[PDB]
Design a protein around this ligand. Sequence first.
Ligand SMILES: *[C@@H]1O[C@H](CO)[C@@H](O[C@@H]2O[C@H](CO)[C@@H](O[C@@H]3O[C@H](CO[C@H]4O[C@H](CO)[C@@H](O)[C@H](O[C@H]5O[C@H](CO)[C@@H](O)[C@H](O)[C@@H]5O[C@H]5O[C@H](CO)[C@@H](O)[C@H](O)[C@@H]5O)[C@@H]4O)[C@@H](O)[C@H](O[C@H]4O[C@H](CO)[C@@H](O)[C@H](O)[C@@H]4O[C@H]4O[C@H](CO)[C@@H](O)[C@H](O)[C@@H]4O)[C@@H]3O)[C@H](O)[C@H]2NC(C)=O)[C@H](O)[C@H]1NC(C)=O
Ligand SMILES: Cc1nnn(Cc2cc(C(F)(F)F)ccc2CCC(=O)N2CCC(CSc3ccc(S(N)(=O)=O)cc3F)CC2)n1
Ligand SMILES: [Ca+2]
Ligand SMILES: [Cl-]
Ligand SMILES: [K+]
Ligand code: NA
Ligand SMILES: [Zn+2]
Length: 804
Amino acid sequence: WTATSGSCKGRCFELQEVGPPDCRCDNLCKSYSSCCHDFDELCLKTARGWECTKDRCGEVRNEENACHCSEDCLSRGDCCTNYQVVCKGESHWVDDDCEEIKVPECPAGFVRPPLIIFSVDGFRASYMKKGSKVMPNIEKLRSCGTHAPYMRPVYPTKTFPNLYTLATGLYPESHGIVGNSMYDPVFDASFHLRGREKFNHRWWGGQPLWITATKQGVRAGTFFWSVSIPHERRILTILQWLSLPDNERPSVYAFYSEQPDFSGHKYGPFGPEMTNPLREIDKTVGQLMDGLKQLRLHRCVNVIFVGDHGMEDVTCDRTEFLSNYLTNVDDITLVPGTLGRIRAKSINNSKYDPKTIIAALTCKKPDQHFKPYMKQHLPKRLHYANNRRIEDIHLLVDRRWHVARKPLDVYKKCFFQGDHGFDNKVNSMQTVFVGYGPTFKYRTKVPPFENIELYNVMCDLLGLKPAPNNGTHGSLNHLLRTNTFRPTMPDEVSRPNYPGIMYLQSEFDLGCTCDDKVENKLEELNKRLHTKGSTKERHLLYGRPAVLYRTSYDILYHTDFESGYSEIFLMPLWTSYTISKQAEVSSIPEHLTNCVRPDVRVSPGFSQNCLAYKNDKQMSYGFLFPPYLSSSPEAKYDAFLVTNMVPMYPAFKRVWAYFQRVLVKKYASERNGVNVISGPIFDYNYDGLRDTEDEIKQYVEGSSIPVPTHYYSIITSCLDFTQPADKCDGPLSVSSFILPHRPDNDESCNSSEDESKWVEELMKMHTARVRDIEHLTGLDFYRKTSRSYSEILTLKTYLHTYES
Ligand SMILES: *[C@@H]1O[C@H](CO)[C@@H](O[C@@H]2O[C@H](CO)[C@@H](O[C@@H]3O[C@H](CO[C@H]4O[C@H](CO)[C@@H](O)[C@H](O[C@H]5O[C@H](CO)[C@@H](O)[C@H](O)[C@@H]5O[C@H]5O[C@H](CO)[C@@H](O)[C@H](O)[C@@H]5O)[C@@H]4O)[C@@H](O)[C@H](O[C@H]4O[C@H](CO)[C@@H](O)[C@H](O)[C@@H]4O[C@H]4O[C@H](CO)[C@@H](O)[C@H](O)[C@@H]4O)[C@@H]3O)[C@H](O)[C@H]2NC(C)=O)[C@H](O)[C@H]1NC(C)=O
Ligand SMILES: Cc1nnn(Cc2cc(C(F)(F)F)ccc2CCC(=O)N2CCC(CSc3ccc(S(N)(=O)=O)cc3F)CC2)n1
Ligand SMILES: [Ca+2]
Ligand SMILES: [Cl-]
Ligand SMILES: [K+]
Ligand code: NA
Ligand SMILES: [Zn+2]
């Protein structure tokens, strides 16, 4: 019930929301069917439209007009945005040269530069170049301010997950808005774009910027706008709020446009019908800037122009149907489109089997345009698993395609030519970022970055302490002139032991053998030196990683590599080695094929054993430092230490051997040396965070050797590739991966072929940020470089994406 017979007189676009049954006058009242009877009349005036003309200049104030051209309008805060242009011979903001804004130039009574977020739905990154002729206001912001060539959205590249990620700094799995449609089995409730359940606050986790602001005494405009409020009125409302007295006036605001998404869906991303929506967004930006200039705020306000996601060409004829694969197609519920999510139709069906559905969808047709995954097998970079609303079965749909249950779903629901929602590495899904204002840099290009980082920066812009989030605070300091947040490196929690030779060979009963019985004082002192770390500067280029949790581990030095060996997990946490451009690849000698050697620095009881691998018929073993890249025949024996061994499924060894034998050398040739850090990851509860021992769900049969869910590598070199990796004086270049440790290669449809036709494609799919590896391992990398910490943070957030 709403008692709609109250009034909005003096309350239009009120900031405090009032409780039912009292009638409302705020931004969102329309969307709740709760506005007072007179809201249209009083708050949505349209008479005479939105622009002053010469003949209105100095008019007698008429309160019926949408906006005003009378002499009192500036003091009332309600001039048409062009008032001073038409009636006082001022220039439009876009016609003025840009001038660096070195300090905020604010009216008296402003305590901080306000922040205005101009958000645009479906604004694909390439519009900045391809639409530039029709967007002069946006182009001036972009060239005069700070801009990235694009900004990476989160997966799925849908509207609600991305807007709320922008507002919270959180991954959808953590904020809870995991799609445009959702089922929550604990609630037993359904969330959709149409209708009322979505207004219940229980869906919306984390803490959005407007709540952060309000809890810390910074006032906020309401961010949301009901669709029938025209854009011109949204701008006027923002500008009116900015004329409020100091104690009432917000410091943070948001504008939102449904365009160009709305048109992009109908006409496709570059349909000729798209020039007009882009023109109109630009005009809106011009209105805001001219309005701010009127208020003498155009060199005071920080403005962010930001998109939620891009838009791709998709048509009804590019739909895959699950009825062409499954027999039982009515025993499932599919959330469909540019992604697929599958669950049982009825929780009273014990004949539901996910395993059989996965097999029925896996590599069934030769050009298949989707790939099924159990959610825990999705690429870790998507961070799309740790939520009860994300269904166990997921379909990653190829760009330009849809998935649907049956053809009848597609014609009893071609209309559309555009859609989005695909993998967030896809070029067509990328979106835009521009920052303009006193606190942003002047005419500065910055590298592409992920939208999860922006919440921290918006908090910095407003002097707020961010709530706990998935940004890496400091990684975007290079966007800012001032207000930088000065992060410190985390403190190492566990210090390593440095074991010397403490055990005789015969103390070991590991059931391992090696043909290594081959006896010189010149080379005897030398090998001692290598074991004490004489080559460590070569192989550990950026310091040892720091261990940020409580544990027991040893540093082990060797000629060709250094490792941090966990007494708890019985294997290295990390293994570091450097491969120069000139290094040679060799084979494992025939005599050493099954060689595993006890490590006399590490007790039998904190060692793996070969017998467990023999008895475990599913599980084999591999090595972290590759025997193929040994620097000499003698150094090669170090690679067969039991302390360099890790459990590997035979199917995974095909991948790992190819990486170690072929790809490491290839990268060293291309990048002029590389430093590699590799290791295991345990994430059995798929939360993106390092498992404790008591969370491990699988061990090598008969043992306490835990089985990794993934293996990582971090591959670093000099950004200036004319310098070798091991003598780089400037910034670094990194690529990383987190490969799933799987017993089959069902993910790779071409895996019966040679590794050269499929392994690298797999690795590219599982590309990662260093930061992703940090969360999964409790390690902190790049602790000792010549680089500034903010720059290192930026490097740790880089994702190598493999798009053109
Ligand atoms: C990205 O950034 C985010 C934010 O920093 C990271 O997520 C955080 O990670 C922490 C570790 O997983 C986690 O900390 C736990 O929080 C518990 C309290 O949680 C509530 O209160 C906070 C505070 O305001 C709130 O934010 C939470 O919000 C979640 O849940 C609500 C619904 O209830 C949702 O609206 C919201 O979207 C959010 O859901 C997401 O997170 C939850 C986990 O909380 C997931 O389950 C969801 O799927 C979704 O992803 C909560 O309202 C706290 O109780 C925990 O403490 C337990 O563990 C410690 C270990 O030391 C133990 O000693 C304690 O005894 C305790 O255990 C007891 O309970 C167990 C569970 O029932 C039980 O089994 C035991 O036997 C014990 O009885 C813990 O501190 C933090 O909440 C989330 N925050 C958010 C916002 O998601 C995220 O990790 C980052 N991602 C990456 C990749 O880095
Ligand atoms: C989704 C979403 N997430 N965050 N925003 C705000 C936002 C963030 C940013 C940002 F700065 F973050 F970039 C910029 C701009 C916005 C405004 C977006 C907006 O007016 N749109 C149109 C209105 C539509 C109503 S739907 C709705 C409302 C309230 C609630 S409630 N009761 O508050 O839980 C629930 C709802 F489902 C949502 C999307 N929208
Ligand atoms: Ca985990
Ligand atoms: Cl969805
Ligand atoms: K075995
Ligand atoms: Na396969
Ligand atoms: Zn859309």
